[model samples]
Target: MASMQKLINSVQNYAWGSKTALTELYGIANPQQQPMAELWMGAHPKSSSRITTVSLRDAIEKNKTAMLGEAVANRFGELPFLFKVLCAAQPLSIQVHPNKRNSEIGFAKENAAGIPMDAAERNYKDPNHKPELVFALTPFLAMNAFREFSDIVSLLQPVAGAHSAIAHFLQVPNAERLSQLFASLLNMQGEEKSRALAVLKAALNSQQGEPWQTIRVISEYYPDDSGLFSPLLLNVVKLNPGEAMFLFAETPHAYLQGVALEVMANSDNVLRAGLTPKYIDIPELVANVKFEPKPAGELLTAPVKSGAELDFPIPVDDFAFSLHDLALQETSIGQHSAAILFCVEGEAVLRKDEQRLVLKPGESAFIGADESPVNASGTGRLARVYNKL
Candidate 1:
């Protein structure tokens, strides 16, 4: 087993900070200039870090399950999830990711096309699905999936003029019609899209609009292009502190603001639609999107006991994490097969055997299964993510 140490990753400002944080810690810099959020703790090949005895990669290669067994077993016993903190300074790309089959096929196709894995136009860097769970660390806002048909129609009804085009198309009376409209927008070509953009810009410029005003504002932030029509088809999700949201593979999502901790399968593959200048694989993104309407569910909130425990909404067992709130009093967190303790708030000292590691907020220390009888005493809370995979 390795002794604990701190791992502080650089933060990138990719509309969402969490993804950027993942890139930084995993040693994948943001060539696309994506924002970063926080640190990631796992052994995913794309970006693995070391704790003590070995690097996260060696640990996984030697024994995948033993390294993250009890903590998460249902999802193939592979440390299939990557944990993170997201700070959204702006809206992330309106994008989706393919599931397993789609991912494999896309990756193979890109590779065959001579597209380098690191190329900006490359859609699939690895063959793995990316289903995610996001838990708010602060008040958060995002656009998740699509709203119920009726709700979207209602929300869009108030826009006037060119913006009314969206409302008018949505008023077409059926989900198929709605889907067709989105298909049209996604499939339009040069001149056709240009004309569409002109009309859409006019509608957006109109003053008679409601709920969609924010959508229009975001669209206006970008050039007057057909891509602005994206907001018309998706629903916006607003989250408060402690709330959580889940995004299945292929569901379109964008975090609008705030900070949160995100957990997802250990993969970096993504297919973009719009809202970003990066490569937009329209065909692939459309192929993966689930056009069905989705209702905004309640935010996930977990009770914090002793000021240090924050339960997340992820159902997988391989990894379970909690935010801890610690004071000057000494506290003993029960032993697990393996655990990674990170200090995201204040300061603390971890005691195991004859070794002691000081943990400051944003710093992390990893403790192995053998590090039982570990004791932590500090002033301020420490976020502990216990892993028993």
Candidate 2:
């Protein structure tokens, strides 16, 4: 266990999770037929990955330099990333994350107010910004950032009668204008909100396109939510298997469907807008969300093709993600900091000096900093994530 430690990860049972995706893809049992939303593979305090009988958090705290590299240990003082397998059957909540400064400010304010960590109304769970990248294991559908002004206009023209805000944006479109209009939509109350939703629902009767279809899907679960309009405002991303994308801070996003591998900085803070029974902090969400339009073509992270690996470019230094297709070839892994290796398909063999850990599909191993570079060989796709520094 000096170098390579096998991990027994935890599965999250959220309502939006897929029923059979985990079982079908990874051979993970789902005897209760519960929604298996996420499979976590990192040492976050809430759901620390198990290294034998000890938690990864405890292990790292016990042997900081050995678990995390000296540089990473000094920089982060703990594991800097959380990796997971996210499978969404139903849509996730329309949400946005605060930047680093906002996170620290919000966390401190909430703590000073004596709000407990597990309180239903708590927003910031930790003071770290959660910028993430998602690699599709299957055809993935998601709403990310904002659609262009003209595209939004076209989609909303039919439903403009739903609310005057839509028509207002149609008259003049800009980042600030869009933000104001969005704020009005989310903040509407009483008869005004009811009237708007009624008009919006009626207008979709003859609509025949993407936003309409997505809106209908949302209506099935959250009929009264204003977020049904999200499909019109946010860019609808279709990620084919093997494709990936990065999520920057202050961006509005929600996972609509399918399975993917997600990696992010260690944090659980979220400000939800709509499409959830959870706390909907409209003011906070609107304040934090970057309302500027993001072109659909520019949404994906173009992976640089290195030898036997597709290295995803992430702006933040907290984590780096890459996919290695080891088809009868030996590839080196984790030369910089501590790393997590997840076998995506087929089989993989990881070796550090004399220690050897074999991983089947869906199995994972944590490579401590002591194992600077582990030799990997087998016929499968393996995802490796580590600190860039």
Candidate 3:
């Protein structure tokens, strides 16, 4: 309990998850038979990992000084990050997480209303803000943020006759109009909503590849979904292996398909808008969302290197992420918050002083606090996650 060791995690079977990815990763016997959506590698209660004898959550709480170290134990009182492997077989919901202040307020308010923690209508799962990033393990496609005002206007102009609301919004300027259009889409129901989607179909016919193709594919399965038109408003990006995108507070995003390694603050709070069968809280989503234009190139998290370690820079104190390319040189991570290291490729040995633990692909490790000056040697690629002040 006082040293580093191998951690056995949980593979979640959400409907959108791939049946092949996690099975292959874990070397499952019946690889293509089931959905393996997310492989959780941290101490979250939903699916906490194991440390040989007990759950990692219990291990940390039982011996905080030995497992979490005194500093992180005194502050967070638990793990500050949730690590995951997102293997998408279908599109995810168009959702955004709340900011820190909103998260805290919404959580307490829901509890006061006597809403059960497991209720479908309940929004906030935990009081921590979930700022996340996804680094592609394969070619990954997604719709993220809003495009420039000029681009959005031009795209929506073609679909004006589809619906009266769509027609009205097209005539107005960007900003407020886009926000209202989003609300209108979520609010639409019955045959009228079908009429709105029909309008999108016509526009999509003339539209080019990727985003349009992606929408048509999603519609094939989720035929009545109004989120089909969302691609016309948001920027669609495709990231190849090792390429990454950072998702911030209130920015709308939906992952289309493929595999990726994801990390976030230890929270499950999500406010969904569209592109899902899950509960859509339009009022809270609209109120908490920052419906404004974003400057270009803000989503990409380019890494900065210092010898063997390459760090992905993000503007949050909740978590830090990077790679340790220890093919030849060794890299060290300072003792900070709890450390979660996931081996994506190659073979390597993690070392904290004389203690060493070897890791293979698909395997991960949780380096407890007091295990300072964490270092690694040998092999392919290692995606590392830890917290910072």
Off-target runs (Cα >4 Å) in candidate 2 are: none
In order of appearance, the predictions have TM-scores of 0.75, 0.95, 0.93
- Shift of residue 52 alpha carbon in model 1, Å: 7.4
Every candidate's lDDT: 0.62, 0.86, 0.80
- Candidate 3: tens digits of C-alpha lDDT, residues 36-94: 88888898877789997789998888877766666677777788778888999988878
Q: Model 1 off-target regions past 4 Å?
A: 8-80, 111-116, 158-171, 189-213, 278-281, 298-308, 334-338, 386-389
Off by over 4 Å in 3: 25-32, 352-355
User: Residues 1-389, candidate 2, lDDT per residue (tens digit)?
Assistant: 55788999999998779989999998999998999999999998889999879999999899898888988988889988899999999888877888888889899989999999988768887786867899999999888989989899888887788788888898888888898788888877788888888887887788877778788877888887878777888988889999988887798898888999999866567888777766566677777888788888899999998778889989887889988888666778755788999999989998877888899999999988887788899997899989888
Decreasing TM-score order of the candidates: 2, 3, 1
Cα lDDT of candidate 3 equals: 0.80
- Per-residue lDDT tens digits for candidate 1, residues 78-155, read 555566666666666776877879889988998999997767677787776645677766677677777777776764
Clashing pairs in 2: none
TM-score: the better of candidates 2 and 3: 2
The alpha-carbon root-mean-square deviation between model 2 and the true structure, to one decimal in Å, is 1.7
TM-score for candidate 3, please give it: 0.93
* TM-score for candidate 2, residues paired by index: 0.95
